[PDB]
Structures are given as structure tokens and as C-alpha cells.
Amino acid sequence: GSGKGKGEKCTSACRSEPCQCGSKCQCGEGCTCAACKTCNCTSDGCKCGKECTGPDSCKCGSSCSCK
Numbered sequence: 482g483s484g485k486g487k488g489e490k491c492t493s494a495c496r497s498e499p500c501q502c503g504s505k506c507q508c509g510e511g512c513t514c515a516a517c518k519t520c521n522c523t524s525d526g527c528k529c530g531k532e533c534t535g536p537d538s539c540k541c542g543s544s545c546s547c548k
């Protein structure tokens with residue numbers, strides 16, 4: 482409809498509300514979506530080992546164990 486086109490690397494699922502990217506995460510790296518692009522590392526202990534210990538301090542991509 483609306484004549485527009487940006488670099489949407491993310492899938493329709495990710496671009497939905499709420500995000501439907503799930504754990505499969507078929508979107509693109511660079512969205513930092515707070516649903517799929519999350520981190521399971523806690524401040525108590527890093528779950529992946531990248532020492533990110535939190536999504537807000539995450540430095541590794543979505544193909545990581547904390548994702």
C-alpha cells in the first residue's frame with residue numbers, strides 16, 4: 482500500500498506487535514528487538530561466557546548460546 486521501502490532485514494514476525502520472532506529468530510542482526518534479541522545471561526553468571534551478563538550489555542550476536 483504505502484509506497485515506502487527501508488532495509489527491513491527483519492521478518493514480518495519480528496516486525497509484529499508483539500514480536501513473533503520467537504526463539505527461531507528469522508529476522509536480521511541490527512534490530513536488537515527486545516523479544517528475540519534478548520540475553521539469558523544474568524549478573525550472577527554469564528550463561529554463554531562472553532561476559533556480557535545481560536542484554537543491555539550484550540556484545541555477541543543472535544547465534545550465541547545466550548540467545
Ligand SMILES: [Zn+2]
Nearest residue numbers: 495500502514
Ligand atoms: Zn524481534
Ligand SMILES: [Zn+2]
Nearest residue numbers: 502506508517
Ligand atoms: Zn529476531
Ligand SMILES: [Zn+2]
Nearest residue numbers: 491495508512
Ligand atoms: Zn529483528
Ligand SMILES: [Zn+2]
Nearest residue numbers: 520533539547
Ligand atoms: Zn549475552
Ligand SMILES: [Zn+2]
Nearest residue numbers: 522527529530
Ligand atoms: Zn553471556
Ligand SMILES: [Zn+2]
Nearest residue numbers: 529541545547
Ligand atoms: Zn552470548
